[PDB]
Design a protein. Sequence first.
Length: 84
Amino acid sequence: GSSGSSGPWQPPADLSGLSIEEVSKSLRFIGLSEDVISFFVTEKIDGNLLVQLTEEILSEDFKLSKLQVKKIMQFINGSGPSSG
């Protein structure tokens, strides 16, 4: 494809290295709220940080919704045999 809008970007296999900026797009994959994304970039949250974050820290500190914490966790781990 010459010119125009093409070339879809996506997150790598491992989330241990991404930058605070890459994270903003990392969540875009699943499609989260505009507030959630910025909530990470504003908290200096990066790739190495995301992987470090846990459901407990996401519900204790972040205190995000039950759905969010569930969506973010699924992104970190990656495993998902349920296949919604």
